[PDB]
Structure formats: structure tokens, C-alpha cells
Design a protein around this ligand. Structure first.
Ligand SMILES: CCCCCCCC/C=C\CCCCCCCC(=O)OC[C@H](COP(=O)(O)OCCN)OC(=O)CCCCCCC/C=C\CCCCCCCC
Ligand code: HEC
Ligand code: HEM
Ligand code: HEM
Ligand code: FES
Lengths: 64, 98, 106, 51, 241, 71, 378
């Protein structure tokens, strides 16, 4: 639960929004045609790495 | 292995020239429907997880190497095919493999 | 083999003299050679005034090194004041050895 | 090199190639017996030392 | 040819230099293993003789030996009977043989949990980042009938089903039993099982930096007062004129 | 090969002094610090250039391996 | 009379280290031979308890190691001494061998040749030892090398069955590998009293080149209290590493239990064979590869017969100083390359780096020393 509150607090910084913007552009193109090749695992990987890096500094403070 | 004949035909459907080391299974084992195998891979030795392989053989993720079902190599850097164990099919139901 | 470039051979020889560093310890070029069975002979063919000097230039410059220091700058062995004292005694021990060896061959 | 060049060292070499040849022959044949070398133990069927 | 995500670094209370393991996250971590993890995983190297002084009192964990009684072997005329269990006995193993595991768990043998900490790049922060990770499958990836998606796992698809969420367990104390804190107190229990030495040796590395301190500038003094005769000698050479 | 049979040597003199009559650190931080200087100076013009090269190749190689998988 | 001189037994230790002439300017780079002497001696007292409680059986091979770590009193201390006191032993040995070359110390024909035999003997002892613990790297080194000595022209087939003592790795494996890894240390404490008996007839060298009989000094007390300071400074470094960060050097692939079946993902050796592994992997074919791996130990022998110089040592030689540092910088590029996959860009650097190890030694140091001779007229 305390993690559930902090994740969106740590998504607020712009280090993680830009890669988030990148994810959608290929995501809609891939689903637009069943003939595309890209699987968005790569564009997924940038977003989780940046998010979980900034979560680290804080979450242990906002525990119990 | 008590091999299924469909897998022998899968093995015999292979085109000879592409093969890295010429070792056809019909001369390797006097029994197409039986096979005897040693785990070690010719390049380094690592042993795959059981029931793996796109082509129906063995898959060593050590260097992306794929070994064939009867003990053959198709992709590098593995030099040659799997060594054939010493054996003698003397008894029809009590096999002497070595 | 060259003449107009012999000014340049002099130029490179004065640079390599300073880069190697035996002059900051007082030594001279002949003090550094490696003593094999042929240089061990040509040493006991020296007069006494020449042999005594060589044993003090080799004991003062092997004490400066135990102390990790160097001699003052006014006492550095110049370039045009180094005399080759052991050269003539060494061409003669050698050419007497090519003679004892082409006798066993003929 | 030049210290060893001459006719006398070549003469000693051709004089003692009997020594080198016998030394090498005895060494090679002994290296067969020592390590239970079956691969040359069979080249002569006369030593049936393998039981 | 697929990339792998690396767990970040967290500020543990036992992280470096001189700081120890707090025995409350470990006292509250066996229970999370006991009532969740165990019925599949083994702890064969780990025995009940070990916990007499780390997390529980001698009889407090002795009473946990009676909770389950292990099958026994050959005794007189009626062997294969059951014994209540005592201090010596090991962590009871779930199956008759490990080969039963492929039967029920889809042909996926569960890894043992004695060295899982040391046998991994990452460490005690790879496991933690595994637990909270479970995510959504992206657009355009197929899966088997019995597989799950995780961007940390090298194959990105693991058989195991998420075993922690909210309100799973009841702590004996009353701390809010939430996913965030159950995961932390598991990553602390396993580490101490990987090493029982992690706290004895941080104390022999501080009483030794002091013996060296006292004795390593006193040999330096003797050495220096033998080489002064030798370091202050002048010299001559007046030859005969 | 012991001390009385090693060489012959002439007209030279030496002037020792006792250990209990002097001090072990005459000047500890006024000589040692300018000493390390001339040493290192004179020599770090032919020890560093070789090790710059291994750094240039190291950064060129991990860069290529990274961008061949992650586009 | 004088007791030491006239007693038949004390008379021998008095000529060896109490009273022999020694040079005045010997540096601290001459302290490593005695460290090796200290280093060799730990490894036999440790290695005693690792067989006394050790069990030689195939079934318990993985489990005997993890067992001894916790159950045995003071076993967690002594186990990491055997594995960390053997990475020390190999850093006092590349320092010792390097030092001799710089100061021209190979003009002792007797002792520079008894030393290259000691260098093969300790390579072998180390390479059995990695293969005892058995776990999913000991097995997957063993297959690689063991297999490749089967490409001998006429004998390779016959050898892999004897060392296996079976078709392959088997219960007998503990019996033999322990048998030959046990034996090796005791032949090495014999070729060391002979390596030193050929040196007590010329004495030491010194970092100048020139020969110094006009000021010798006893060996007591001047180098028996500089040798103690050295060894203490060493126990200090060896103990920061096993009471603070023991696991910094190994690999976390060893632990995974004994399985014939499992596949190790990323095979690679311990850090001090990673320059050998980069040679063998650089060349196509079985038979040419094994020849390029024995070449290096065998190259040190061509040392004294390539010397072209009027002076001994590199102290007074600027041009030949620079190369020294190149051979060394280029033996750091064979340790980085060898601990990774073959690679798209790692094959081109990877086998350019190797030849150069060969080019400089066999072609470029002999030529460059001549331009120095010609440039100061001998
Ligand atoms: C990391 C790998 C090891 C890096 C060690 C780097 C040491 C850097 C400090 C040494 C450099 C320095 O201090 O200045 C140069 C200094 C100058 O000293 P002098 O002899 O008095 O010369 C005086 C006038 N030139 O040079 C030295 O002292 C050289 C000392 C000997 C070098 C020994 C180091 C051994 C490393 C090389 C090993 C590679 C070969 C191994 C062979 C194994 C074959 C299988
Ligand atoms: C019987 C169901 C089951 C449950 C419930 C269960 N485990 Fe697992 N565990 C498994 C299986 C099956 C695997 C992986 C086997 C495989 O992938 O081949 C596994 C893997 C693991 C791993 C390693 C994960 C990895 O990626 O390698 C750990 C650690 C572990 N279990 C401990 C635990 C913990 C801690 C819990 C409670 C959060 C738990 N087990 C609950 C069966 C279970
Ligand atoms: C130069 C000397 C030696 C070296 C370099 C050396 C090296 C090694 C190494 C690297 C290991 C790996 C084990 C691990 O990673 O924990 C090992 C294990 C072992 N060594 Fe040695 N060793 C030496 C001398 C000896 C001696 C004299 C013995 C005498 C019995 C010995 C007995 C053992 C044993 C029994 C193991 C068991 C494997 C284990 O317990 O992990 N070693 N050695
Ligand atoms: C177990 C291995 C070894 C031991 C115990 C050992 C020990 C020693 C010792 C104690 C000395 C005394 C002189 C000094 O301390 O400088 C010495 C000198 C020497 N060693 Fe070794 N050594 C070993 C390996 C080697 C190797 C591998 C070589 C390879 C060439 C070598 C070559 C030499 C040489 C040339 C000297 C001459 C010393 C000088 O230049 O003055 N040794 N060694
Ligand atoms: S089978 Fe050769 S490296 Fe894996």
C-alpha cells in the first residue's frame, strides 16, 4: 500500500514521462496492423528502469 | 531413447550438404529406432535442459548452440557431431552398450 | 655513412646522452659495460693510476642510490670531457681470439 | 654465429650422429615400454606382454 | 537475443562497514516462509538446531518441532512409525523424492532455497525486485497456458504464481501486514540463511584493525634506528701526489 | 667467497657515527615531499602514454556491443 | 672458540643467511621472493585440514563443501583462506618474474632455467583445485580442456580414458584429481632448495647493472628486519579481504548444486587464467590452438640468446624502457577480452591483441637495442 502511494509520486518527475511518451507511439502502430514486427518489450524496458531508479531513494523512508 | 520412427524420418529429411560434420544416423546406430548418447558437447561440454529445441533436438544456451536429436551439430561454434558411445547390440532385450 | 647529416647525428647523440642518466652520478661510459670473460681480462692489463680511479667512481655512485639522491649540478660529467680509457685494451683481447679459432678450422 | 662454424664441428657432428642416433633410438623404443604403449607394442607381435 | 533488467540498490540496515542484521525482520521472516513458501521449497541444509539464539528462545522454537511430525525409518518390529520430533531434526522436505515436483508443477523443478542468495547476480535485491514486479503482457507476445509475465526474469515468462499480496498473513505483533513489508522481511530471512557468519566476522575485522595499529609503527621505529649508521657515512680519496 | 678474499682497494677513508648519538627523522616533511616530486617528475613522461591507449579502446568497445542489440 | 663456526650443523646456517655478502642498494622489489616463500607455506598448513575433514566420494562432492562451511568449528575462516591465499600467490609471482627481466637477471643460466619449470608446475596444481568443488563450473571447465587434449595426432584418444579412470568424470575422479593435486606441492619444495643452491655461488644482482664487490654488507641485521616489515604489511592486506569482502574475486556460478544435466549460461575461468583462454579461442582449428598455448611458457627460454646489448638492464636505456610498458599494457587487454562472449567486435581486437604479444618479443626488442649500441659507439 505505501508503495502504491509512492509509485505515482515518483512518476511525477519528467525523467520518466518522456520514455512514457515513446511507448504509446509504437504501441498504437503495432496494434493498427497485425502485420507489424515490433514488440514493445524494448520501449517497456526504458520506462520501468527510469521509474524504479527514483523509487529507490524514498520508499524505505515512507514505510511504517 | 526408444526412438519414434517419425523422428528418424525427421532426421533423414535433413539435406546433407548444409551439415557441419558428416555423420548420418543410419550408420551411427544399427537401430534407427534406438539411440545411445553422451551428454558432452564437442565445443565445451555443457548439457541442455531436457525437452528443448526448435528442430527437435537439444539447445545449449551457452553460445546459442543447437545439437540435433541423434547427436549432430548444425550451428557453431561446436566443431563436430556428438561422439558415438562404444556399444554392441548383442541381445535383443539385454543391451550391452560398452 | 652520411656527411651533411653528421650534424644531425651529433644532435641526436647529445639528446640521448642526457636522457640516459649516468652523468648525474658521476660515471663515465666505460664504467657501465657488462663484465664477461673477455672484459674480465682487459681489466688486469691496466696501469695502476687508471685502475684505482675506476674503483672510486663506482663506489661513490652506488651510495648515492642507497640514499635516493643525486649529485649537485656543477659536478655533472660533460659531453666533451669523457675519455674512453678501456677501449684500446679491448680490441686486442678480441682479435687474438679470432686467430686461435681459425687455426682449429684449417 | 661464428665460434662454432668450421669443418671440425661438422665432423664431430657426423662422427657422433651414431651417438645421437643410438641415443634417440633407445629412448624412443624405451618410451614404448615405459608407458604401456600398445600402439607400437603391436608393430612387433613378438612382445605379448599385455597378459 | 533479449535484454535483462538489473535490480537497483537499496539502503539496507546491514549494508556496509560495521552495521549488523536487526533480528526482528528475521524473527518476523521465518513465519512468512513457514505459512507460505515452504510446502514446495526445501531447506535441507538448514536445521532447527540453528535458531536457538538468533530469532527465538530454546523452547520457543522447540515447540515448533511438534507442529509436524516426520516419518521415520527402521526400528523394531513395526518400523516406519512416526516420532514427535526433537531438537536435532531438519527442516521437513515436502515430497518423497524431488522427481514428484515435475509431476505436479508442470515439469519445473523448484529451486532450493539454501544458497539462492549467493547464486545470483543481484543478490538480496534481485529477489525483492522479482516479487513486486509482476506486470502486464505487452502488445504482441504469446504465452503458454501456464506462464506468467515478468520483465526481470531472463525468459520473461515464469511458471510461478504471485504468492504475495495485501492481507496474506497475520503478524504476531500487529504491524500492518502489507505486500511492501512482507517482501522485505523475506529478503532478510533468506540472506541470514545464506550466511550464518555475516555478524561474527564484522566484529573480528574491527578488533584487528587495532592490533595492526599498535604494532605497525613500532617495527618501523626499530628498522629505522639500524640504518642510521649506514645512512650517515661520509667518504674520502686523497691519493698519493 | 667470504670477506677477506674479495678485491683489493687503496687510499680511501670513511667517517661513521653512533646510532644512540643522533636522531632517526632529521627532516621528515621538508625533504621527503620535494624528493617524491623530482622522482615522479623525471619519470611519468614514459609510463602514462601506454595506459591512455587501453582506456581509448575500452570505451570504443563497450559502446559498440551496446548499440548492436539496443539499436 | 666460536661455536657457530666450528659446530658441524650451525656452520651451515651461518654461511646461508647470517653472514654472506649482500649489496648496499637492493630496493623493495627484491622483497617478493621471500613473500613467495611465506606464501607457499600457508597453503600446506591450510590444505591439511581440508582433507582431514574432507571426504573423497562422488555422491557427496557438492555437499561436502557446503557442509564444512557451517557445521565445523572455525571452518568458515579456514575455507576462504585456501581460496584467497591462492590469488595472493599469483600476484607475488607475476611481480617476481617481471622484475628479473627489467634488471637483466636472466644471465644466470642455471637459475633462470630451473625457474621456468616451477612455472608450469604451479599452473597445474591450481587447475585441478578449481575442479574439486564440482559445481556447475568445476564440471564445465573440466570438459573443455579434457576434451581438447584428444586432438593429439596419435595418442589423444588413449589419454582421456585413463585420467577419467572410466568413460568420463566418475566416482574415481575424487580419487585421482585429489591424488595428483595432493602430490604437486611436495615436488615444488624440492626444486626450490636447488633453485637457491645455484645462486649462492654468484650472489645477488642490483638495480644498476654494474658489479659491486667493493662495498658488501652482512645479511644481519640489515635485511632480516626489512624482510619482517615486508611480511607484516602483507598479512594486513590478506586480512582486509576475508573479514570484510571475501566474495569480491570469485564467481556466483559455482554454488548451483551438482547436476550433470543443467546448462551453465556463461562459462569462464578464474581471473588468472583469462589471458590463456583468450589465446586458445583466437585461432581456428583444434591442433594449432594447443600449440599457441604452450608457446608462451616455452618462450621464456629463448631469453638469454636474443640479448644484443652492451649494458645489462633497462635502467640506463630510455628507448627500451617504453616497450616494457607496452608488453604490460597489452597483457591487460587479454584479461578483459577473455571474460566475455566471442562478440561481433571482440573477435577483431581479440586476435590483433594476441599476435603482438609475439611480435615484440621476437622481432622488436632485438632490433631496437642495436640502435642504442650504434648511438653511443658501444
Ligand atoms: C596493474 C598491473 C601492474 C601495474 C604496476 C605499475 C607500477 C607503477 C610504479 C612503477 C613505475 C615507476 O615507479 O617508475 C619507473 C620505475 C623506475 O625505477 P628504476 O629502476 O630505478 O629506473 C630509474 C631510472 N629510470 O620502474 C620500475 O621500478 C620497474 C620495476 C619492475 C616492474 C615490476 C612490475 C611487474 C608488472 C609487469 C609484469 C608483466 C610480465 C609478467 C611475465 C609473466 C609471463 C607469463
Ligand atoms: C507450489 C507453489 C509455490 C508457492 C506458493 C511458492 N513457491 Fe516459490 N517456487 C515455486 C516454483 C514452482 C518455482 C520456480 C520453479 C521453476 O521456475 O522451474 C519457485 C521459485 C522460487 C524462488 C526463486 C524465484 C526465481 O525466479 O528463481 C524463490 C526465492 C522461492 N520460490 C521461494 C518462495 C517464496 C519466498 C514464496 C512466498 C512468496 C514461495 N516460494 C511460494 C513454488 C512455489
Ligand atoms: C600453490 C599451492 C595451491 C594452490 C594454488 C591451490 C589452489 C586451490 C584452489 C584455487 C582451490 C579451489 C577451491 C575453492 O575455490 O574453494 C583448491 C581446493 C582444494 N585444495 Fe588446493 N591449492 C594449493 C595447495 C594445496 C595443497 C598442498 C593441498 C593439500 C592437501 C590442497 C588441497 C586442496 C583441497 C582438498 C581442495 C578441496 C576443494 C575445496 O575444498 O574447495 N591444495 N586449491
Ligand atoms: C615457488 C616459486 C619461487 C620461489 C619460492 C622463488 C624464490 C626466490 C628467492 C627466495 C630468491 C632470492 C633472491 C631474491 O629474493 O631476490 C629468488 C631469486 C630469483 N628467482 Fe625465484 N622464486 C620462484 C619462482 C621463480 C620463477 C618462476 C622465476 C622465473 C624466471 C624465478 C627466477 C629467479 C631469478 C632470476 C632470481 C635471481 C635474483 C636476482 O636477480 O638477484 N624464480 N627466487
Ligand atoms: S556447447 Fe560449446 S560453448 Fe556451449
Amino acid at each position: 500500500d505505501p508503495l502504491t502511494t509512492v509509485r505515482e509520486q515518483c512518476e511525477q518527475i519528467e525523467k520518466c514521462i518522456k520514455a512514457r511518451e515513446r511507448l504509446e507511439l509504437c504501441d498504437q502502430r503495432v496494434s493498427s496492423r497485425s502485420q507489424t514486427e515490433e514488440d514493445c518489450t524494448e520501449e517497456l524496458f526504458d520506462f520501468l528502469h527510469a521509474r524504479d531508479h527514483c523509487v529507490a531513494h524514498k520508499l524505505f523512508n515512507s514505510l511504517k | 531413447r526408444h526412438r519414434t520412427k517419425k523422428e528418424i524420418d525427421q532426421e533423414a529429411a535433413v539435406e546433407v550438404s548444409q551439415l557441419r560434420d558428416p555423420q548420418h544416423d543410419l550408420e551411427r546406430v544399427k537401430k534407427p529406432e534406438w539411440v545411445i548418447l553422451i551428454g558432452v558437447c564437442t565445443h565445451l561440454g555443457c548439457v541442455p535442459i531436457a525437452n528443448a529445441g526448435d528442430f527437435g533436438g537439444y539447445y545449449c544456451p551457452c553460445h546459442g548452440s543447437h545439437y540435433d536429436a541423434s547427436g549432430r551439430i548444425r550451428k557453431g561454434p561446436a566443431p563436430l557431431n556428438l561422439e558415438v558411445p562404444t556399444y554392441e547390440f548383442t541381445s535383443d532385450d539385454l543391451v550391452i552398450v560398452g | 655513412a652520411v656527411a651533411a647529416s653528421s650534424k644531425w647525428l651529433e644532435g641526436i647523440r647529445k639528446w640521448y646522452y642526457n636522457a640516459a642518466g649516468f652523468n648525474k652520478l658521476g660515471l663515465m661510459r666505460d664504467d657501465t659495460i657488462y663484465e664477461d670473460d673477455d672484459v674480465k681480462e682487459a681489466i688486469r692489463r691496466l696501469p695502476e693510476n687508471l685502475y684505482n680511479d675506476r674503483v672510486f667512481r663506482i663506489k661513490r655512485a652506488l651510495d648515492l642510490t642507497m640514499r635516493q639522491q643525486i649529485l649537485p649540478k656543477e659536478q655533472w660529467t660533460k659531453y666533451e670531457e669523457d675519455k674512453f680509457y678501456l677501449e684500446p685494451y679491448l680490441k686486442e683481447v678480441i682479435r687474438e681470439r679470432k686467430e686461435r679459432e681459425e687455426w682449429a678450422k684449417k | 654465429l661464428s665460434r662454432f662454424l668450421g669443418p671440425r664441428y661438422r665432423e664431430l657432428a657426423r662422427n657422433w650422429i651414431p651417438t645421437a642416433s643410438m641415443w634417440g633410438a633407445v629412448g624412443a623404443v624405451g618410451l614404448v615400454w615405459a608407458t604401456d604403449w600398445r600402439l607400437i607394442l603391436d608393430w612387433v607381435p613378438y612382445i605379448n606382454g599385455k597378459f | 537475443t533479449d535484454l535483462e533488467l538489473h535490480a537497483p540498490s537499496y539502503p539496507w540496515s546491514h549494508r556496509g562497514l560495521l552495521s549488523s542484521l536487526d533480528h526482528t525482520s528475521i524473527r518476523r521472516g521465518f513465519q512468512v516462509y513457514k505459512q507460505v513458501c515452504s510446502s514446495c521449497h526445501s531447506m535441507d541444509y538448514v536445521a532447527y538446531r540453528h535458531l536457538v539464539g538468533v530469532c527465538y528462545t530454546e523452547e520457543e522454537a522447540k515447540a515448533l518441532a511438534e507442529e509436524v511430525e516426520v516419518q521415520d525409518g527402521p526400528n523394531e518390529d513395526g518400523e516406519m512409525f512416526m516420532r514427535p520430533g526433537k531438537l536435532s531434526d531438519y527442516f521437513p522436505k515436502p515430497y518423497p523424492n524431488p522427481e514428484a515436483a515435475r509431476a505436479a508443477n508442470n515439469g519445473a523443478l523448484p529451486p532450493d532455497l539454501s544458497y539462492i542468495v549467493r547464486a545470483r547476480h543481484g543478490g538480496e535485491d534481485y529477489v525483492f525486485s522479482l516479487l513486486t514486479g509482476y506486470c502486464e503482457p505487452p502488445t504482441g507476445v504469446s504465452l503458454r497456458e501456464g506462464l506468467y509475465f515478468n520483465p526481470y526474469f531472463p525468459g520473461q515468462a515464469i511458471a510461478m504464481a504471485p504468492p504475495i499480496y495485501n492481507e496474506v498473513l497475520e503478524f504476531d505483533d500487529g504491524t500492518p501486514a502489507t505486500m511492501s513489508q512482507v517482501a522485505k522481511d523475506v529478503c532478510t530471512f533468506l540472506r541470514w540463511a545464506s550466511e550464518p557468519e555475516h555478524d561474527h566476522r564484522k566484529r573480528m575485522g574491527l578488533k584487528m584493525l587495532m592490533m595492526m595499529g599498535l604494532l605497525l609503527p613500532l617495527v618501523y621505529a626499530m628498522k629505522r634506528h639500524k640504518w642510521s649508521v649506514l645512512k650517515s657515512r661520509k667518504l674520502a680519496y686523497r691519493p698519493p701526489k | 667467497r667470504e670477506f677477506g678474499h674479495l678485491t683489493r682497494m687503496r687510499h680511501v677513508i670513511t667517517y661513521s657515527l653512533s646510532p644512540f648519538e643522533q636522531r632517526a627523522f632529521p627532516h621528515y616533511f621538508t625533504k621527503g615531499i620535494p624528493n617524491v616530486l623530482r622522482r615522479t617528475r623525471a619519470c611519468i613522461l614514459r609510463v602514462a602514454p601506454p595506459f591512455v591507449v587501453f582506456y581509448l579502446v575500452y570505451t570504443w568497445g563497450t559502446q559498440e556491443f551496446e548499440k548492436s542489440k539496443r539499436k | 672458540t666460536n661455536i657457530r663456526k666450528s659446530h658441524p650443523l650451525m656452520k651451515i646456517i651461518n654461511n646461508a643467511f647470517i653472514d654472506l655478502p649482500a649489496p648496499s642498494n637492493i630496493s623493495s622489489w627484491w622483497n617478493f621472493g621471500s613473500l613467495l616463500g611465506i606464501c607457499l607455506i600457508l597453503q600446506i598448513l591450510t590444505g591439511l585440514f581440508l582433507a582431514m575433514h574432507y571426504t573423497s566420494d562422488t555422491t557427496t562432492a557438492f555437499s561436502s563443501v557446503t557442509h564444512i562451511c557451517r557445521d565445523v568449528n572455525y571452518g568458515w575462516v579456514i575455507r576462504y583462506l585456501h581460496a584467497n591465499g591462492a590469488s595472493m600467490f599469483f600476484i607475488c609471482l607475476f611481480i617476481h618474474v617481471g622484475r628479473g627481466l627489467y634488471y637483466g637477471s636472466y644471465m644466470f643460466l642455471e637459475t633462470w632455467n630451473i625457474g621456468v619449470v616451477l612455472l608450469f608446475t604451479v599452473m597445474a596444481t591450481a587447475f585441478m583445485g578449481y575442479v574439486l568443488p564440482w559445481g556447475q563450473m568445476s564440471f564445465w571447465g573440466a570438459t573443455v580442456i579434457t576434451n581438447l587434449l584428444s586432438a593429439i595426432p596419435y595418442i589423444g584418444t588413449d589419454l582421456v580414458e585413463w585420467i577419467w579412470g572410466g568413460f568420463s568424470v566418475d566416482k574415481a575422479t575424487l580419487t585421482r584429481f585429489f591424488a595428483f593435486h595432493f602430490i604437486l606441492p611436495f615436488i615444488i619444495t624440492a626444486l626450490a632448495a636447488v633453485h637457491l643452491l645455484f645462486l649462492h655461488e654468484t650472489g645477488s644482482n642490483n638495480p644498476t647493472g654494474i658489479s659491486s664487490d667493493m662495498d658488501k654488507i652482512p645479511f644481519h641485521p640489515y635485511y632480516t628486519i626489512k624482510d619482517i616489515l615486508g611480511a607484516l604489511f602483507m598479512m594486513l592486506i590478506l586480512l582486509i579481504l576475508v573479514l570484510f569482502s571475501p566474495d569480491l574475486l570469485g564467481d556466483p556460478d559455482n554454488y548451483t548444486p551438482a547436476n550433470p544435466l543443467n546448462t551453465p549460461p556463461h562459462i569462464k575461468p578464474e581471473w588468472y587464467f583469462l589471458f590463456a583462454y583468450a589465446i586458445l579461442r583466437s585461432i581456428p582449428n583444434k591442433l594449432g590452438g594447443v600449440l599457441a598455448l604452450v608457446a608462451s611458457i616455452l618462450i621464456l627460454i629463448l631469453m638469454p640468446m636474443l640479448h644484443t646489448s652492451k649494458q645489462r638492464s633497462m635502467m640506463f636505456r630510455p628507448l627500451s624502457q617504453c616497450l616494457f610498458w607496452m608488453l604490460v599494457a597489452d597483457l591487460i587487454t587479454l584479461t578483459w577480452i577473455g571474460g566475455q562472449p566471442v562478440e561481433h567486435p571482440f573477435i577483431i581486437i581479440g586476435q590483433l591483441a594476441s599476435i603482438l604479444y609475439f611480435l615484440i618479443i621476437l622481432v622488436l626488442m632485438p632490433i631496437t637495442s642495436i640502435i642504442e649500441n650504434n648511438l653511443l659507439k658501444w
